């Protein structure tokens, strides 16, 4: 499977941050080449760095990659606007078919203060239900930087089918928003004691449930 | 060294699309290739993966849909996708590995150094159509417009016919996996206006002309 990033990290401009990356042992004890990817908003990846510290063309001094055995790590100094975009690692060795991928980090730049998510959720509406549908809406605002991760919960367990999620969009205050649907069929709502949703924000969590009622 | 990418596009489900990738300063039949897809917001993801001598693996759920061939002529290799479905939408992307290998004993591995722009692909059973509105109902109170199952964009949004804009947050709308958006409006109000004051929320989706004037009533 995938190796393990966090989903966002942020540092303030002339700083450094580190990008982490889990699991490179998983997978048998062959020596691990360990690429680095960006990829700036609207664009295609970009090969940065390779065997874990090794830097590719024109990257700065600024990028470099050291290793702990299963955890390869992404050292950005300097931070600056540029730097604002998503990193992927990638684990390849002699016999692997497709190079290992993490799931991504967005980094952020901070440009201002960071600001927690506002999150307000709304049952389904009866006239939907009328309609044999069901949307739960989680409305998720005046967030910095603009970052989320949106998970929902079914009484207690995860719900990953029919969850539709925006990219987060800046606001004219310069804060961020962002938008998650959880479609249902009547049945699954009526059928269940809750549905939650789950809004992660640089390590912090809003949770707001709903009851059919 | 470049690769350069033409085709995609829009098919409803079980149709059919090509992706083209050519390459520029080297030859893509003696190279180590992939293809990628990434879902709107989300991460990367393997599609396929063809080796220097030309034999090509897929990931388990494109395999038999999907089919990489070389065009030799064109310097370059072919993404045919049969039988879409929702789950292909994205943006796909060629790329180019650079390894050092002998026999089957890798020396050394640099990584996808070379990658085309990305080609758009949406899988979409989505035409013209007006949304429906639904109430969100209700110190102070946040009341809302649902604004579901539209297309193409956009719809605009106003309350009370525009006497009310003082605490309106209209949303980016969501691009669903149907292919159809939905945008929700809420306003914050004092609660003692609630049954006093009545809200009304302007819904207009020109490309249906359609027009929404929905009242969103306490519960």
């Known amino acids: 499977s995938a190796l393990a990033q966090p989903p966002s990290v942020s540092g303030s401009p002339g700083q450094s941050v580190t990008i982490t990356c889990t699991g490179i042992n998983d997978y048998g004890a062959a020596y691990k080449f360990v690429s680095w990817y960006q990829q700036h908003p609207g664009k295609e990846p970009r090969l940065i760095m390779k065997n874990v510290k090794d830097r590719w063309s024109v990257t700065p001094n600024r990028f470099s990659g050291s290793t702990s055995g299963n955890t390869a790590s992404l050292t950005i100094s300097n931070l600056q606007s540029d730097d604002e975009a998503q990193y992927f690692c990638a684990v390849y060795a002699g016999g692997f078919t497709f190079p290992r991928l993490g799931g991504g980090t967005k980094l952020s730049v901070l440009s201002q203060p960071k600001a927690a998510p506002s999150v307000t959720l709304f049952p389904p509406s009866s006239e939907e239900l009328q309609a044999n549908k069901a949307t739960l809406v989680c409305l998720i605002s005046d967030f910095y930087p603009g970052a989320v991760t949106v998970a929902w919960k079914a009484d207690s367990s995860p719900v990953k089918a029919g969850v539709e999620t925006t990219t987060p969009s800046k606001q004219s205050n310069n804060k961020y928003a962002a938008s998650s649907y959880l479609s249902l069929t009547p049945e699954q709502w009526k059928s269940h004691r809750s549905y939650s949703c789950q809004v992660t924000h640089e390590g912090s969590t809003v949770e707001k449930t709903v009851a059919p009622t | 060294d470049r690769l350069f990418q033409s085709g995609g596009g829009v098919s409803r489900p079980g149709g059919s699309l090509r992706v083209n990738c050519g390459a520029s300063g080297f030859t893509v039949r003696t190279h180590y290739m992939y293809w990628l897809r990434q879902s709107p917001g989300k991460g990367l993801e393997w599609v396929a993966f063809?080796?220097?001598?030309?034999?090509?693996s897929y990931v388990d759920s494109v395999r038999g849909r999907f089919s990489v061939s070389r065009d030799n002529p064109a310097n370059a290799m072919v993404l045919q996708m049969d039988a879409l479905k929702i789950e292909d939408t994205g943006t796909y992307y060629c790329?180019?590995?650079?390894?050092?290998?002998?026999?089957?004993?890798?020396?050394?591995?640099?990584?996808?150094?070379?990658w085309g722009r990305g080609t758009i692909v949406s899988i979409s059973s989505a035409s013209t159509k007006g949304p429906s509105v639904f109430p969100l109902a209700p110190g102070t109170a946040a009341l809302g417009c649902l604004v579901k199952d539209y297309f193409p964009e956009p719809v605009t949004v106003s309350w009370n016919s525009g006497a009310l804009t003082s605490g309106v947050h209209t949303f980016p709308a969501v691009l669903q996996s149907s292919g159809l958006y939905s945008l929700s409006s809420v306003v914050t109000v004092p609660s003692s206006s609630l049954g006093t004051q009545t809200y009304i929320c302007n819904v207009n989706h020109k490309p249906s002309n359609t027009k929404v004037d929905k009242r969103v009533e306490p519960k």
């Open positions: 063809m080796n220097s001598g030309g034999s090509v």
């Open positions: 790329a180019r590995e650079l390894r050092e290998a002998w026999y089957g004993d890798l020396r050394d591995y640099s990584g996808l150094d070379v």
